Amino acid sequence: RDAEDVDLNHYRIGKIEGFEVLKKVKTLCLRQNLIKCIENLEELQSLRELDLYDNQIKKIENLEALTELEILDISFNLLRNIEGVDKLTRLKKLFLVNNKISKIENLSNLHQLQMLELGSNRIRAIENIDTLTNLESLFLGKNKITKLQNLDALTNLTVLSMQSNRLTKIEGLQNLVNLRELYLSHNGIEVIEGLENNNKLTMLDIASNRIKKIENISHLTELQEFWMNDNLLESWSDLDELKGARSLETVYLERNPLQKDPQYRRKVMLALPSVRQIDATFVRF
Amino acid sequence: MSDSEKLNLDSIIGRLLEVQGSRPGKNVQLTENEIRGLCLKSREIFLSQPILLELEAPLKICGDIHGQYYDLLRLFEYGGFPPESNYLFLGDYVDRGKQSLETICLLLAYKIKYPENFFLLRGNHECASINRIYGFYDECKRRYNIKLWKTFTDCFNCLPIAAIVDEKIFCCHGGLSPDLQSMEQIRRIMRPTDVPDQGLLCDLLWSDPDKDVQGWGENDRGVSFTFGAEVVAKFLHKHDLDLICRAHQVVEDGYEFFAKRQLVTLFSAPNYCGEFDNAGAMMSVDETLMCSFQILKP
Ligand SMILES: [Cl-]
Ligand SMILES: [Cl-]
Ligand SMILES: [Fe+3]
Numbered sequence A: 001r002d003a004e005d006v007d008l009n010h011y012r013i014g015k016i017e018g019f020e021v022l023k024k025v026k027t028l029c030l031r032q033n034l035i036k037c038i039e040n041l042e043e044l045q046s047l048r049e050l051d052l053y054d055n056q057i058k059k060i061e062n063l064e065a066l067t068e069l070e071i072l073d074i075s076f077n078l079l080r081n082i083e084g085v086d087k088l089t090r091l092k093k094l095f096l097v098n099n100k101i102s103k104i105e106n107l108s109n110l111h112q113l114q115m116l117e118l119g120s121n122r123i124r125a126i127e128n129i130d131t132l133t134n135l136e137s138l139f140l141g142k143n144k145i146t147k148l149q150n151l152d153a154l155t156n157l158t159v160l161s162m163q164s165n166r167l168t169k170i171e172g173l174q175n176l177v178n179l180r181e182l183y184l185s186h187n188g189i190e191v192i193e194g195l196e197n198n199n200k201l202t203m204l205d206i207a208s209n210r211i212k213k214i215e216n217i218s219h220l221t222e223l224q225e226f227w228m229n230d231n232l233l234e235s236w237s238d239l240d241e242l243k244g245a246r247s248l249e250t251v252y253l254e255r256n257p258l259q260k261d262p263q264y265r266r267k268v269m270l271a272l273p274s275v276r277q278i279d280a281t282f283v284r285f
Numbered sequence B: 001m002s003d004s005e006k007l008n009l010d011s012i013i014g015r016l017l018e019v020q021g022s023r024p025g026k027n028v029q030l031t032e033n034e035i036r037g038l039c040l041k042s043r044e045i046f047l048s049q050p051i052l053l054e055l056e057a058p059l060k061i062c063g064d065i066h067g068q069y070y071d072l073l074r075l076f077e078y079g080g081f082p083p084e085s086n087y088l089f090l091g092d093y094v095d096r097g098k099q100s101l102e103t104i105c106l107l108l109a110y111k112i113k114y115p116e117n118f119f120l121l122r123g124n125h126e127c128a129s130i131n132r133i134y135g136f137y138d139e140c141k142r143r144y145n146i147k148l149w150k151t152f153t154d155c156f157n158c159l160p161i162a163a164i165v166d167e168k169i170f171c172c173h174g175g176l177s178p179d180l181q182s183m184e185q186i187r188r189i190m191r192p193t194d195v196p197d198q199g200l201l202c203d204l205l206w207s208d209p210d211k212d213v214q215g216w217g218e219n220d221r222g223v224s225f226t227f228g229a230e231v232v233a234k235f236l237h238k239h240d241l242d243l244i245c246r247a248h249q250v251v252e253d254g255y256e257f258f259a260k261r262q263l264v265t266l267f268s269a270p271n272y273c274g275e276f277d278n279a280g281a282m283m284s285v286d287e288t289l290m291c292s293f294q295i296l297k298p
Helices: A236-242 A264-271 B003-017 B032-047 B069-079 B100-113 B135-143 B146-156 B183-187 B200-206 B229-238
Strands: A005-007 A027-029 A049-051 A071-073 A093-095 A115-117 A137-139 A159-161 A181-183 A203-205 A225-227 A250-252 B052-055 B059-062 B087-089 B118-120 B162-165 B169-172 B216-218 B225-227 B243-246 B255-258 B263-266 B280-285 B291-296
Touching (some): B003 B032, B003 B100, B032 B100, B032 B146, B069 B100, B069 B280, B069 B291, B135 B146, B183 B200, B229 B243
Parallel strands (some): A005 A027, A027 A049, A049 A071, A071 A093, A115 A137, A137 A159, A159 A181, B052 B162, B087 B118
Antiparallel strands (some): B059 B280, B162 B169
């Protein structure tokens, strides 16, 4: 009756009934329940967080009342469209992980959104997020996206996750000047390019692609992790591109042609003496 | 194992077991190095044992866990917490739900503490990409960082693939492969490796049985194949085996036989997701190669 945090994780509940008894609830957790629709929540006007991770909700609705909501998670449901969030202006994080969403819409009014999570969906393009100026983390991995584009407005974005998509060219990153972590593994990229402005990158991952040569990253002097396993790199001289990164600690290069060299680990250590981790294993001295 | 290793290992297992009996939802927050060390140390042990494990009874064989950490705890209450019993898990330890880290950390810790009495096979959820699985990657970055998931794929890439118990029970996560002619081909699989979308290693983690199929058929999953009862029978005769013990599919009672009890499917996650109402089972083998099935309920 008097709790700021209420947790009904794994309670078999199949319907939202009788939550008006909670006076000043601030966090409501309803994960791994049996909810089939959103309802009977218009009274809990003190909520910052609502958690509906892993249910069977098929449409977003009945949330317009809770305008102090700051964190909303409707992951692992059966959503097909994004809607009914236009009134939650103080939303900072929004998780819609692993649904059946196909298009990015209806988020234009969430100006304070710091993290958008649309991983494991059926999205095919990046659109309609020019308005999210405060976005710091964008997660679109495991989708059907085919081009990097409408990202030019997110100048404060620091983490871009785009693994497991249908990309074929690195482009459209010209304005992400504060970008710090870039994940593009499991795509169809063949050339490293288009990173001229991302000087503050510390974590870059282009593993599991079809890249033949390391280029155009000699200016990335802040690199701390370079993940490039499962590509087609063949020339040890390409590692000259990374010598400006004096704090480079980890590189992944295994299952490249380079690893056929019986001096593979030795050559990495000679080229990049600051590196402490090569693939899974530490450099042992 | 060093005494300093035992000290930190028991500290981790203690804090992981301390939430037992609590009202589910408690997570236990370990430090990043504790989780990372668990990955590195267990990976070294995986590489120091064959990729085709040859185990002897007695041991307890379990199917999927799917990150349901408190249901894993209940399994250990029925079968006995290590080292009171020997365990062989058949894969799929992580999934959706925000308690996959506790599940894998407890399994990895017991693997390090009892490396010749505790065993983990690789499931298709222990892959090195998010081409088809997002929950475990999602949990890692939300509680820690993406690199932690990367370190986990390093450990996953070194898990063993199949096991043969007392020269008579073949164990894998998925099932048989049309490319599988000899046990040597499994031994030829090299680590670290990810799970391909095609080939022997893929089928060992992905294939299913089917009543309808007579030989090899296509899989409604979009990967690998389906095999029928005849496939099973020729396989046991060619390799002089008695049983295929596998997981990977939800079954009503946690266990389910196939091809006149020549194959069995085990599933150890009760009420998977939520729309199902299945039980978890567990097959126990004793010194005389006798199989008994214990069933866990929601
Ligand atoms: Cl053989
Ligand atoms: Cl090996
Ligand atoms: Fe599976």
